[PDB]
Write an enzyme that holds these catalytic residues in place. Sequence first.
Site, mmCIF file in Angstrom:
data_model
loop_
_atom_site.group_PDB
_atom_site.id
_atom_site.type_symbol
_atom_site.label_atom_id
_atom_site.label_comp_id
_atom_site.label_asym_id
_atom_site.label_seq_id
_atom_site.Cartn_x
_atom_site.Cartn_y
_atom_site.Cartn_z
ATOM 1 N N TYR A 28 0.747 -1.250 0.000
ATOM 2 C CA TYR A 28 0.000 0.000 0.000
ATOM 3 C C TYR A 28 0.779 1.305 0.000
ATOM 4 O O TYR A 28 0.221 2.350 -0.333
ATOM 5 C CB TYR A 28 -0.992 0.005 1.165
ATOM 6 C CG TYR A 28 -2.113 -0.982 0.965
ATOM 7 C CD1 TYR A 28 -1.917 -2.348 1.172
ATOM 8 C CD2 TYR A 28 -3.358 -0.556 0.506
ATOM 9 C CE1 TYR A 28 -2.944 -3.270 0.921
ATOM 10 C CE2 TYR A 28 -4.384 -1.462 0.251
ATOM 11 C CZ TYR A 28 -4.171 -2.814 0.459
ATOM 12 O OH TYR A 28 -5.189 -3.706 0.205
ATOM 13 N N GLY A 30 2.574 3.564 -1.775
ATOM 14 C CA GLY A 30 2.941 3.895 -3.138
ATOM 15 C C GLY A 30 1.724 4.343 -3.921
ATOM 16 O O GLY A 30 0.768 4.861 -3.344
ATOM 17 N N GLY A 32 -0.077 2.197 -6.068
ATOM 18 C CA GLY A 32 -1.047 1.117 -6.166
ATOM 19 C C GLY A 32 -1.162 0.303 -4.887
ATOM 20 O O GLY A 32 -0.200 -0.329 -4.452
ATOM 21 N N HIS A 48 -4.265 5.188 5.347
ATOM 22 C CA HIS A 48 -4.131 6.482 4.689
ATOM 23 C C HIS A 48 -4.936 6.495 3.387
ATOM 24 O O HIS A 48 -5.655 7.458 3.100
ATOM 25 C CB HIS A 48 -2.646 6.766 4.428
ATOM 26 C CG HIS A 48 -2.378 8.105 3.814
ATOM 27 N ND1 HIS A 48 -1.904 8.252 2.528
ATOM 28 C CD2 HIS A 48 -2.505 9.359 4.313
ATOM 29 C CE1 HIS A 48 -1.747 9.537 2.262
ATOM 30 N NE2 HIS A 48 -2.105 10.230 3.329
ATOM 31 N N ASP A 99 -3.181 12.894 6.347
ATOM 32 C CA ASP A 99 -1.730 12.944 6.234
ATOM 33 C C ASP A 99 -1.051 12.956 7.594
ATOM 34 O O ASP A 99 -0.069 12.247 7.807
ATOM 35 C CB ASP A 99 -1.298 14.174 5.439
ATOM 36 C CG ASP A 99 -1.665 14.078 3.968
ATOM 37 O OD1 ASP A 99 -2.250 13.053 3.550
ATOM 38 O OD2 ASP A 99 -1.362 15.034 3.229
#
EC number: 3.1.1.4
Length: 123
Positions: A28, A30, A32, A48, A99
Site C-alpha cells: 500500500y 505507493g 497502487g 491512509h 496525512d
Amino acid sequence: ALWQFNGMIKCKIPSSEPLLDFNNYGCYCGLGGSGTPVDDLDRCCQTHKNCYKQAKKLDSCKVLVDNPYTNNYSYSCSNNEITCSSENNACEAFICNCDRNAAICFSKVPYNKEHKNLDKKNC
Ligand SMILES: [Ca+2]
Ligand SMILES: [Cl-]
C-alpha cells in the site's frame, strides 16, 4: 498535497527522505494499493488510502477539481509536532488530518527493509 505529506513525515522522522524511504513499500505505500498489508507500516498506508477514499466521498471535496496529492493545505511542524491549520476549509482539513495521522503512524511502527520494492505478486 504530496509536498506537504512529505514534509509531515520528515517532521516526525527527521532522518528520512519520505519520497524515497516510504515509496514502493509493501502493498500500500505507493501509487497502487491492493491485497493484505504485509506489516504495520503497510497498514499505516492502507489506512491512509482509505482515509483519502472517505474524503472523496464528502460533499465538501467534490469541488476541488484538484487531486488530493496536488491539493495544497496549510499546516506547521514545530518541535517535531504536526498541526493542521484552522484556516483549512472542509476538504483540505480532512486531507490534512489523513496525512498527519499517517505520518505519526509511520513514526510509530517498525521499518522492514525486506518489504521495500515488494514484488506485487504477493499483493
Ligand atoms: Ca491480489
Ligand atoms: Cl504530531
